[PDB]
Enzyme design. Structure first.
Site, PDB file in Angstrom:
ATOM      1  N   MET A  25      47.089  14.729  42.117  1.00 23.31           N
ATOM      2  CA  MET A  25      47.273  14.154  43.443  1.00 23.31           C
ATOM      3  C   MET A  25      48.316  14.971  44.193  1.00 23.31           C
ATOM      4  SD  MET A  25      47.151  10.058  42.708  1.00 23.31           S
ATOM      5  CE  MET A  25      48.846  10.070  42.133  1.00 23.31           C
ATOM      6  N   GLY A  26      47.894  15.614  45.278  1.00 18.45           N
ATOM      7  CA  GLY A  26      48.788  16.419  46.090  1.00 18.45           C
ATOM      8  C   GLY A  26      49.406  17.587  45.346  1.00 18.45           C
ATOM      9  N   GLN A  27      54.235  17.538  40.242  1.00 24.66           N
ATOM     10  CA  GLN A  27      52.910  17.354  39.663  1.00 24.66           C
ATOM     11  C   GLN A  27      52.707  15.907  39.223  1.00 24.66           C
ATOM     12  OE1 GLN A  27      51.838  19.182  35.757  1.00 24.66           O
ATOM     13  NE2 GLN A  27      50.171  20.177  36.886  1.00 24.66           N
ATOM     14  N   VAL A  28      51.945  15.153  40.012  1.00 26.53           N
ATOM     15  CA  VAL A  28      51.662  13.748  39.740  1.00 26.53           C
ATOM     16  C   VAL A  28      50.169  13.609  39.478  1.00 26.53           C
ATOM     17  CG1 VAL A  28      51.877  11.382  40.542  1.00 26.53           C
ATOM     18  CG2 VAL A  28      53.561  13.093  41.245  1.00 26.53           C
ATOM     19  N   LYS A  43      53.516  11.117  36.373  1.00 30.40           N
ATOM     20  CA  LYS A  43      54.258  12.350  36.597  1.00 30.40           C
ATOM     21  C   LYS A  43      54.571  12.993  35.252  1.00 30.40           C
ATOM     22  CE  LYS A  43      57.451  13.281  39.655  1.00 30.40           C
ATOM     23  NZ  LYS A  43      57.227  14.739  39.857  1.00 30.40           N
ATOM     24  N   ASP A 137      67.379  12.116  52.042  1.00 31.24           N
ATOM     25  CA  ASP A 137      66.195  12.677  52.688  1.00 31.24           C
ATOM     26  C   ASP A 137      65.112  11.631  52.943  1.00 31.24           C
ATOM     27  OD1 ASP A 137      64.505  14.456  53.858  1.00 31.24           O
ATOM     28  OD2 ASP A 137      64.293  15.786  52.127  1.00 31.24           O
TER      29      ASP A 137
HETATM   30  C1  LIG Z   1      52.800  12.386  51.530  1.00 34.78           C
HETATM   31  C2  LIG Z   1      53.191  12.174  50.085  1.00 34.78           C
HETATM   32  C3  LIG Z   1      52.281  12.984  49.192  1.00 34.78           C
HETATM   33  O1  LIG Z   1      51.302  13.550  49.653  1.00 34.78           O
HETATM   34  N1  LIG Z   1      52.607  13.028  47.904  1.00 34.78           N
HETATM   35  C4  LIG Z   1      52.547  14.258  47.130  1.00 34.78           C
HETATM   36  C5  LIG Z   1      51.482  14.015  46.067  1.00 34.78           C
HETATM   37  C6  LIG Z   1      51.800  12.772  45.247  1.00 34.78           C
HETATM   38  C7  LIG Z   1      51.962  11.564  46.160  1.00 34.78           C
HETATM   39  N2  LIG Z   1      52.333  10.376  45.353  1.00 34.78           N
HETATM   40  N3  LIG Z   1      53.620  10.463  44.771  1.00 34.78           N
HETATM   41  C8  LIG Z   1      53.759   9.307  44.096  1.00 34.78           C
HETATM   42  C9  LIG Z   1      54.980   8.954  43.320  1.00 34.78           C
HETATM   43  C10 LIG Z   1      55.901   9.912  42.941  1.00 34.78           C
HETATM   44  N4  LIG Z   1      56.788   9.145  42.312  1.00 34.78           N
HETATM   45  C11 LIG Z   1      57.884   9.657  41.747  1.00 34.78           C
HETATM   46  C12 LIG Z   1      58.483   9.090  40.623  1.00 34.78           C
HETATM   47  C13 LIG Z   1      59.622   9.615  40.025  1.00 34.78           C
HETATM   48  C14 LIG Z   1      60.210  10.752  40.552  1.00 34.78           C
HETATM   49  C15 LIG Z   1      61.437  11.344  39.928  1.00 34.78           C
HETATM   50  C16 LIG Z   1      61.961  12.634  40.484  1.00 34.78           C
HETATM   51  O2  LIG Z   1      61.970  10.772  38.991  1.00 34.78           O
HETATM   52  C17 LIG Z   1      59.647  11.347  41.668  1.00 34.78           C
HETATM   53  C18 LIG Z   1      58.509  10.799  42.245  1.00 34.78           C
HETATM   54  N5  LIG Z   1      56.484   7.777  42.268  1.00 34.78           N
HETATM   55  N6  LIG Z   1      55.262   7.681  42.963  1.00 34.78           N
HETATM   56  C19 LIG Z   1      52.576   8.436  44.213  1.00 34.78           C
HETATM   57  C20 LIG Z   1      52.114   7.112  43.740  1.00 34.78           C
HETATM   58  N7  LIG Z   1      52.892   6.332  42.951  1.00 34.78           N
HETATM   59  N8  LIG Z   1      50.881   6.719  44.132  1.00 34.78           N
HETATM   60  C21 LIG Z   1      50.106   7.495  44.918  1.00 34.78           C
HETATM   61  N9  LIG Z   1      50.469   8.707  45.380  1.00 34.78           N
HETATM   62  C22 LIG Z   1      51.678   9.232  45.068  1.00 34.78           C
HETATM   63  C23 LIG Z   1      53.061  11.851  47.176  1.00 34.78           C
END
Ligand SMILES: *CCC(=O)N1CCC[C@@H](n2nc(-c3cn(-c4ccc(C(C)=O)cc4)nn3)c3c(N)ncnc32)C1
Length: 265
Positions: A25-26, A27-28, A43, A137
Site C-alpha cells: 500500500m503506497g 513499507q506497509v 508494517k 509534522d
Molecule cells: C496519504 C497517506 C498514504 O498514502 N500512505 C502511504 C501508504 C500507506 C498508507 N497507510 N499507512 C497506514 C499506517 C501507517 N501506520 C504506521 C504505524 C507505525 C509507524 C511507526 C513509525 O511506528 C508508522 C506508521 N499506521 N497506519 C495505513 C493504515 N493503517 N491503513 C490504510 N492505509 C495506511 C499511508
C-alpha cells in the site's frame, strides 16, 4: 506483547505465516488473517535495514502501543518478531486526506473538515498531555480516513514560524486551507527554503471569504495561522473554539461521503 492479534476484542494466537500478503500500500503491507478473514495493515521493519529508520519506527510504535485509549490514533493489533524482521499489525484504514483531495479534484466540504479538525486536535492534545509528544509534522498525508467515517492520525512546508528561529497548530491550519480550497497555499515555491521565506515574510494564508465558509471555520483557521507563536492558542484554548464545539456533536455522515469520493475514477 508479540505473536498475538487483537481484532475487536478477540485475541488470536498468530504467527507471520498466518497472514496472506495482498500487496503493498503506497513499507506497509495489506494482509489478510487466514484464521478469520480480517484484512489488516502490516508494517515490516527489517533488522538489516537502515538504523535511522528502525530507530524512529521503534520509537513511534512505543507511542502507538501507549495510545490504545485514544480513538483518533491508528491502533496496533499486535506485533510479530522473527529472527530477521519485525511485523507490526495495524488497523487498516481507507486512505489519507491527500489522496481524498486528489480523488475529489477539488475542495473538501467544511462539514468533513469539521469532523477532521475535532479528531486531529484531540489526537495532538492526547499526545502532549499523556505522552509528552509534540507531533512535529501535521499534514494531509498523516490524516487517515476509512469507509466507516473514522478519522485518525497516522504517523508521529508546514513548519511554524517559531520552529524556524504550539508549532503543530500552524501545520493543522495550513492543512485545513489546502483541503478547504484544493490548493496548497505554497504551491508556487520551488525549494523548501522558498516556502520558509513566505511563511515569515508574507501574511498567513487565510481561508477565502467567497466560498461560503462559516465564520467559525475562518476563525479557527486564523487562530491556527498566528505567526507570533506566543499568541498562538493552546490545545486547551483550541478545544473550546466554537468550530470545535459545533462538530463535537453535529452528526456528519463521513462514511457515506468517503464512499462517494472513493467511487470516482
Ligand atoms: C496519504 C497517506 C498514504 O498514502 N500512505 C502511504 C501508504 C500507506 C498508507 N497507510 N499507512 C497506514 C499506517 C501507517 N501506520 C504506521 C504505524 C507505525 C509507524 C511507526 C513509525 O511506528 C508508522 C506508521 N499506521 N497506519 C495505513 C493504515 N493503517 N491503513 C490504510 N492505509 C495506511 C499511508
Amino acid at each position: 506483547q508479540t505473536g498475538y492479534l487483537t481484532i475487536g476484542g478477540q485475541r488470536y494466537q498468530a504467527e507471520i505465516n498466518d497472514l496472506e500478503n495482498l500487496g503493498e500500500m503506497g513499507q506497509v503491507w495489506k494482509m489478510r488473517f487466514r484464521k478469520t478473514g480480517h484484512v489488516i495493515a502490516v508494517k515490516q521493519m527489517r533488522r538489516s535495514g537502515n538504523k535511522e529508520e528502525n530507530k524512529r519506527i521503534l520509537m513511534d510504535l512505543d507511542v502507538v502501543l501507549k495510545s490504545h485509549d485514544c480513538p483518533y490514533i491508528v491502533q496496533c493489533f499486535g506485533t510479530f518478531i522473527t529472527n530477521t524482521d519485525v511485523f507490526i499489525a495495524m488497523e487498516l484504514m481507507g486512505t489519507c486526506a491527500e489522496k481524498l483531495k486528489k480523488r475529489m479534484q477539488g475542495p473538501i466540504p467544511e462539514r468533513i473538515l469539521g469532523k477532521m479538525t475535532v479528531a486531529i486536535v484531540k489526537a495532538l492534545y492526547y499526545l502532549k498531555e499523556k505522552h509528552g509528544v509534540i507531533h512535529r509534522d501535521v499534514k494531509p498525508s498523516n490524516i487517515l480516513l476509512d469507509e466507516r467515517g473514522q478519522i485518525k492520525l497516522c504517523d508521529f512546508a508546514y513548519m511554524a514560524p517559531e520552529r524556524i528561529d504550539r508549532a503543530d497548530v500552524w501545520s493543522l491550519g495550513i492543512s485545513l486551507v489546502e483541503l478547504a480550497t484544493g490548493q496548497f497555499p505554497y504551491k508556487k515555491c520551488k525549494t523548501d527554503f522558498e516556502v520558509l521565506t513566505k511563511v515569515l515574510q508574507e501574511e498567513p494564508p487565510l481561508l477565502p471569504g467567497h466560498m461560503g465558509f462559516s465564520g467559525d471555520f475562518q476563525s479557527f483557521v486564523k487562530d491556527c495561522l498566528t505567526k507570533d507563536h506566543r499568541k498562538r492558542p493552546k490545545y486547551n484554548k483550541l478545544l473550546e473554539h466554537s468550530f470545535i464545539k459545533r462538530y463535537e456533536t453535529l452528526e456528519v455522515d463521513v462514511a457515506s461521503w468517503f464512499k462517494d469520493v472513493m467511487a470516482k475514477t
